[PDB]
């Protein structure tokens, strides 16, 4: 696939794929959300946003974050609230990493939206995480 | 204030600690150099530079890089050639990560220099890597 979106839990200094919303995670785990981009025809300069939200009765705007970046000339441009993001190039693949930590009980989602060529939608995905 | 400086090689999707000049690595391996900062009280703003150099009969200026960052008011400031650097905040320590790839045969070093108030030297360390 040209785009991929994954959540990893840091366990004993290894990244372990989080592959089911059914699995409750304990608090105090580091998470990494990874957007992998394989460039090609029509895929170069991009606008990307990550949307972190929590859900349920105790939904709070306080826990909401948007991380907005652009990729221009294969370089990362921090647009808004994107200081913790990082871009890494590995063998024709660009990986954008968003770090988080499990802290509040309940359902949390991270959504990613990728647009290019004057706002054409290239990719959207979302990962839910349950925390004890 | 306490500092640590470590090098990790990615081997089967895990960060494996690479001790300085402890073995020869093949080409096309990913490396991460991590400076960990355990800030003490009144440490003030910091100026940090990483210096990459290669050594031997084929010492080459085109392989040298300097990555310069500051920590000002507890935020990362990318000063020069620091787009690939990232800063992760953990419980009681900051971690600055410098990614590299093994590409040229011989000895290479990554040196880190940390200065603070009045250009006072707080820390210096260096790690060497052998590449096949």
Q: What integer value in Å does the Rg of chain A equal? A: 15 Å
CATH class of chain A: Mainly Beta
- Name the chain pair whose interface involves the most residues: A-B, 15 and 16 residues
Q: How many helices of chain A does DSSP assign?
A: 0
CATH architecture designation of chain A:
Sandwich
General shape of chain A: globular
Quote the beta fraction of chain A. Answer: over 45%
Keywords:
Immunoglobulin-like, 5-stranded antiparallel β-sheet, Cytidylate cyclase (chains A, B), unknown function, Pycsar
List the helices and strands and how they pair.
Two copies of one chain form a homodimer.
Chain A: E1 3-11, E2 14-17, E3 24-25, E4 30-37, E5 46-55, E6 65-72, E7 75-80, E8 86-89, E9 94-101, E10 106-116, E11 120-131
Parallel strand pairs in A: 3-11
Antiparallel strand pairs in A: 1-2, 1-4, 4-9, 5-6, 5-10, 6-7, 8-9, 10-11
What would you note in describing this structure?
- 2 copies of one chain form a homodimer.
- Chain A has 132 residues and is an all-beta fold.
- Chain A has one domain: Immunoglobulin-like (Sandwich), CATH 2.60.40.
- The first copy, chain A, is built from no helices and 11 strands.
- The first copy, chain A, has strands at 3-11, 14-17, 24-25, 30-37, 46-55, 65-72, 75-80, 86-89, 94-101, 106-116, 120-131.
- Chain A has a 6-stranded mixed β-sheet with strand order 3-11-10-5-6-7, with no helix packed on it. The first copy, chain A, has a 5-stranded antiparallel β-sheet with strand order 2-1-4-9-8, with no helix packed on it.
- In chain A, strand 10 and strand 11 (120-131) form a beta hairpin.
- The interface between A and B is medium-sized, with 15 and 16 residues.
């Amino acid at each position: 696939s040209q785009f991929n979106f994954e959540c990893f839990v840091i366990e004993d200094n290894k990244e372990v794929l989080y592959n089911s919303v059914s699995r409750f995670l304990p608090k105090k785990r580091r998470l990494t959300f990874k957007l992998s981009i394989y460039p090609g025809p029509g895929i170069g300069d991009l606008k990307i946003i990550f949307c972190k939200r929590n859900h349920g009765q105790e939904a709070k705007d306080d826990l909401s974050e948007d991380y907005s970046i652009s990729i221009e000339d294969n370089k990362l441009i921090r647009v808004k609230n994107a200081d913790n993001l990082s871009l890494l190039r590995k063998d024709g693949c660009y990986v954008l990493t968003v770090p988080e930590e499990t802290l509040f009980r309940g359902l949390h989602t991270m959504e990613v939206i990728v647009r290019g060529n004057h706002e054409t939608l290239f990719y959207r995905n979302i990962i839910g995480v349950y925390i004890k």
